[PDB]
Amino acid sequence: APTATLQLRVAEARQLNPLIRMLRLCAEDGRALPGFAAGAHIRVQVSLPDGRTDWRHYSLINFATARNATNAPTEYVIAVRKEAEGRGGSRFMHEGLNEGDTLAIEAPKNDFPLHTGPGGSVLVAGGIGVTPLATMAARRRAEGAPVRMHYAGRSRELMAFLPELQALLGDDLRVHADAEAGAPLDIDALLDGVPAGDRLYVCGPKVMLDAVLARTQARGWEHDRVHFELFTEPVAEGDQPFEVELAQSGQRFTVPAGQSILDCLIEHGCDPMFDCKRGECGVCAVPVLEGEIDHRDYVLTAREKAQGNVMQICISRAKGARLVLD
Numbered sequence: 001a002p003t004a005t006l007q008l009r010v011a012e013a014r015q016l017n018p019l020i021r022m023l024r025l026c027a028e029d030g031r032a033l034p035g036f037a038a039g040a041h042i043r044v045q046v047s048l049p050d051g052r053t054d055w056r057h058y059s060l061i062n063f064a065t066a067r068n069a070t071n072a073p074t075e076y077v078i079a080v081r082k083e084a085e086g087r088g089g090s091r092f093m094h095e096g097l098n099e100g101d102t103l104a105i106e107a108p109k110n111d112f113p114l115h116t117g118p119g120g121s122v123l124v125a126g127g128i129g130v131t132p133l134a135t136m137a138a139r140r141r142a143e144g145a146p147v148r149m150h151y152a153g154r155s156r157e158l159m160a161f162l163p164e165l166q167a168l169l170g171d172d173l174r175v176h177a178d179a180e181a182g183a184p185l186d187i188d189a190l191l192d193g194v195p196a197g198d199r200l201y202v203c204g205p206k207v208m209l210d211a212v213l214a215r216t217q218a219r220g221w222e223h224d225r226v227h228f229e230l231f232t233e234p235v236a237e238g239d240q241p242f243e244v245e246l247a248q249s250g251q252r253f254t255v256p257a258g259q260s261i262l263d264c265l266i267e268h269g270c271d272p273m274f275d276c277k278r279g280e281c282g283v284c285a286v287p288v289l290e291g292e293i294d295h296r297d298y299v300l301t302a303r304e305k306a307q308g309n310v311m312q313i314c315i316s317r318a319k320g321a322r323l324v325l326d
């Protein structure tokens with residue numbers, strides 16, 4: 001049940017700007033690490049402010065355009081945005097980790113892969129959400145495949161990897177900075193510009209991913225045309241408690257405000273199906289017999305959400321005070 005881990009050394013730390021720190025991680029003896037495909041992340045072990053150990057996802061970064069670029073890597077590269085008001089994990093990555101330190105990680109996992117079907121690729125990055133999309137861009141360039149990146153942030157001063165991405169993509173990089181535009185990214189115009197059949201890869205904050213989801217579902221885009229990678233944690237936000245009644249056996253649990261339905265069930269004892277835990281994979285779907293749902297996933301169709309008979313319990317909640325689940 002414990003997940004396999006690697007003990008890596010911090011081979012380089014680089015302050016890209018005041019908020020974002022690049023870390024290069026190597027095996028102790030420089031041997032090859034598990035390979036990965038564009039979109040993969042690693043989970044890294046952090047110490048929280050009270051000394052509790054926990055795990056944090058960070059996407060793997062590569063700009064090299066050799067076709068073998070990430071098949072047998074000898075390093076993993078990540079970039080961490082410091083959240084001074086977060087839970088302490090990103091703070092640890094900035095303040096409690098030094099060059100030469102060792103760090104336990106879990107082997108790469110990929111919930112956000114590039115699609116090999118027909119069509120080019122349009123990448124939509126919000127802030128530090130650029131990290132797996134940079135690797136995606138590098139891979140499409142390695143393939144000679146059409147790719148465009150929309151990279152949006154509040155200020156250019158705080159957006160990482162602009163010189164690397166400009167060199168990699170040239171005119172196929174479109175940078176949006178709120179501080180220059182005076183307005184947020186125009187997602188409607190972005191979607192209008194996507195070439196017919198091209199697939200969309202959206203990574204970053206919940207508010208951006210939600211705006212893309214609403215519009216691509218309104219447009220009736222095919223379900224495998226749009227791909228989502230949600231960085232925002234915790235997914236259990238402002239949220240309220242609610243009752244869950246398990247219809248098979250009458251048990252009524254109270255889901256607290258800071259806990260997902262899935263985590264509440266996993267805790268109390270059941271064996272739910274799950275994987276990504278952030279609304280992307282679809283695996284945790286449960287039928288809903290009664291109660292209005294506040295849907296927060298990126299996998300159910302507009303029709304499925306409207307019918308009200310299924311939800312992703314890793315991320316979605318009750319609209320009211322009670323849900324009856326099968």
Ligand SMILES: Cc1cc2nc3c(=O)[nH]c(=O)nc-3n(C[C@H](O)[C@H](O)[C@H](O)COP(=O)(O)O)c2cc1C
Nearest residue numbers: 057058059079080081086087088089090131231233
């Ligand atoms: C799949 C996945 C990939 C992520 N990749 C990054 C990343 O590359 N850089 C980053 O700053 N945060 C990334 N995040 C968000 C972090 O895991 C984490 O939530 C963030 O650093 C805040 O944690 P904290 O509140 O403990 O500081 C990712 C989250 C997920 C689920």
Ligand code: FES
Nearest residue numbers: 275277282284314
């Ligand atoms: S576990 Fe992936 S959608 Fe819930």
